Design a protein around this nucleic acid. Structure first.
Lengths: 282, 282, 282, 282
DNA sequence: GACATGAGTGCC
DNA sequence: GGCACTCATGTC
DNA sequence: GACATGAGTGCC
DNA sequence: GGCACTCATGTC
């Protein structure tokens, strides 16, 4: 129905694959030709279905009737998720070699900063698949089902999680500390203390974000990258990243990563997805 | 040339009129058949043109090339400005008689919360036409002019007003306290402390805004109403509102206004634009 | 055994009467010729007996063997409780008539600031008789018993009340808010946040006390007078004071009291203890 | 005139030796047979003289006429400075061989915590002798000279040192951060933020003190030890203490000192004054 | 991965 | 001897 | 209109 | 009494 453009190239298989690995049961549905999920914008609810059209370098978006009143916001959330703004020529011509292998690489964003904040926290320590597992159990117990689409369920809202028993969340398979971190976040979201859109001084905001209980530098960085689509942040503390920069310390990986400014987020993504990458033999 | 839907009725004449009186020179251009303005989204900039289609209950939006990359967010911004999500038969079915004369009334939003905050501040005590001219001088001194469209100029940014000399701003025609309110607000915007979207707990947020230097209850209420498009806030501290409820104190006005919950913001717009309105013997 | 002198005249009948009405069962014993109570200074504990010898305008202090290693401290605490430093000629001189019916009037201090802090809070609203009873219940539940004096009990320490159960104190006959006030005061004392000695800036210090939950302006003023023995503070908010200045508001009474500077604490006492008194309708 | 008791043994040579080395000209006089200094308690001023009487295990205190009204507090101030409360059998019973060589060792305290705070700060990174002269300069420049004893100057009040020009202090011979630290400490004293008496939770109160400018973990410790006479604190960050524990790191010394709880302050003093001392090679 | 604790390494 | 900026530990 | 004071009112 | 809320009132 609705239609948005993008600038070639765009590696849709890479993106869909990336979302699929983290997809949450009952919330999202990922296939090789499309993406679909529940979506809440205020008291408006429905299902969004994104269908890319390669030959035409366009993305078709369909909305169930309940989301029509806020169509444009849905579109906006979709374009942030898919990084439709990216000019690959600018980024690739900057990252050089590092990106030459997957020039269609895009930054997977989010459809809602609060959700991403919940995802990031639950992604602490565990495996990607284990976080999706955990996130799935949290959505199941605290999310709302769509009257029109029972197979689907909306991600738990800020109020619902703000009013959850720490013990209950703990029972889903996470420390008490993690559950407290989640509740705190829902409140920050209710009060407007969790920036929902990318802030002008990402560095400063990430510092404030770290004063949140349960949110360390990794979570704040990862949340900035995904939740805000901050394009120039690296994850020198990441598990896989330490495994790509053998024997290097956080401030080293960090100083190194500086050569990719101001597209460190994209460089980070390429490294994660470059099977045998290793720092330059310099 | 995009397109967005709206439900009838929609009083465009009234809306464009409300925007026209507050139109800021070089930033916005208002006519009886279209609205247009400079628009910045991150580092992307251009000019938006909104043409209403009464024939097909549609709103045609056109963007210059420099904004096309972030097209979706632009459409979202225009939909919040024009209140396209509104179901008038629901609001008026609730407001009753108060809304029967102007059922097409809509809540004039903003295209960016930061800008709206600045306008709210530069609108204190002075006249509407004055705030407009005053605000234009600020946009004149701190705005980013568009290369693609020299005639237009982007609204100041938080980083540009945060680094502004108090005295300089004051010399444009405002007390020093107000120049300082603008500087503080820009800072808050920079670090993510200023909610850019409607928060879950609208008054907890408004209470927090009242700690900001230069922001009292009237400014908070007004900011929430237009900046967040909060649908259930009333302005019992408003000059004109006090005149509409002869000899009534803020609390009495607020008590009375409860009859229009959960659509007090619409009630407010109807009462503001209904000369000679007066409360019942209730 | 030990002896401390004073400057005549000293109204011991008034001093003992005042202390006698506020005495806490098992903690203090007040008779016509002597005062005695439990006393803890660190881990040193015992009983203190003070016998005033009018003839030789001296004060005889006896100390249980347990307090002997900290004799001086006990002596200084007795001198602060009895305002032995007072020069009646200077106060009665700077006060004129107001302080002529009882020039022996002394400011009753305290033996420990935290204790006075607790008394001040528990002395809120209820009558003096109820405050003493209420306080007696608190001492009875959290106090320390003296092995050599089974009849006496040490006033509760900050370490016990800080650990106290809010509900336990509430059960003694006080609002939950007042018990929480006590718990917080005890935590402040443990942390070194409660000034145990008169600060140089009493006004600033009191303003800081008022940020303590359960502590308003009255409690802070009363605590300064008794707890720090600050000599220049008035209780414009006091109940009995309001009756002493009919028709006048806290600020009027306060403007009036400026005439007795810098001995307002004393004036406050005289006016307090003069049923007939009334202001000069200037 | 006045007499205070102490339990033997008491190494007076050592004590007077410790105070004489740190004596401030115009403030205190220290001789073989006595100790003397200016003293201010409110608006009462004068000279205090302490003379130990070894024959009867007592200390004689003489107060100049100006301090009689507050004699008891003066007596208490002397008891805290000379650690009269100490029971050497308990301490020495616990310390074992560590204090067998000097069973009369006492903890040199102070007569005022503010003053002690200033001395702690002025003695940072300098020699005992320099600190004394440095301090003396400060005293002379901001003190209150006694009319009855011309050569005696009262130590600078908090009010006087708060309003001191941050440069005049630099002049005397201290860094810029050094003088700001003094001016800060002084305001705290005025507002009641600097505990004047030992808090129930020393570790906590010390943490808070460390948030003070110019006050680090070393000064906070030394301050607790002398200004509050806390008996169980150690100084692993002390230069001399480092030399006494060859190699070992701050945390290791600390863990070793634990063997002397709850008298680490005494353990500390013994180690300071036992030259070829070295830990057990165990 | 979050978080409080702990070793160090130059400049005031 | 304060004080800011890293890494190494060691439960949860 | 933001914002100190000040004084009322009513519910802990 | 504490305290949050409410209604002048005077200033910038």
């Amino acid at each position: 129905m609705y239609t948005l453009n993008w600038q070639p190239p765009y590696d849709w298989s890479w993106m869909l694959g990336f979302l699929a690995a983290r997809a949450v049961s009952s919330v999202e549905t990922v296939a090789d030709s499309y993406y679909a999920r529940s979506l809440a914008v205020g008291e408006y609810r429905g299902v969004v279905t994104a269908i890319p059209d390669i030959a035409r370098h366009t993305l078709h978006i369909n909305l169930s009737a309940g989301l029509e009143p806020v169509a444009a916001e849905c579109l906006a959330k979709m374009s942030r998720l898919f990084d439709l703004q990216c000019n690959p020529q600018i980024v690739n011509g900057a990252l050089g070699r590092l990106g030459a292998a997957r020039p269609g690489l895009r930054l997977p964003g989010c459809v809602d900063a609060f959700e991403q904040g919940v995802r990031a926290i639950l992604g602490q320590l565990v495996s990607v698949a284990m976080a999706a597992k955990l996130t799935a159990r949290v959505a199941q117990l605290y999310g709302e089902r769509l009257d029109d689409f029972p197979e689907y369920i909306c991600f738990p809202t800020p109020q619902r999680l703000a009013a959850a028993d720490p013990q209950a969340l703990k029972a889903l398979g996470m420390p008490l500390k993690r559950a407290e971190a989640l509740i705190h976040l829902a409140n920050a979201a209710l009060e407007g203390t969790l920036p929902m859109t990318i802030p002008g001084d990402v560095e400063q905001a990430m510092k404030t974000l770290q004063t949140f209980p349960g949110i360390g530098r990794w979570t704040a960085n990862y949340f900035a990258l995904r939740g805000w689509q901050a394009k120039d942040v690296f994850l020198p503390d990441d598990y896989l990243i330490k495994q790509r920069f053998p024997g290097m310390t956080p401030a080293q990986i960090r100083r190194y990563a500086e050569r990719w400014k101001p597209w460190r987020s994209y460089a980070l993504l390429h490294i994660w997805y470059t099977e045998g990458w290793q720092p330059d033999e310099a």
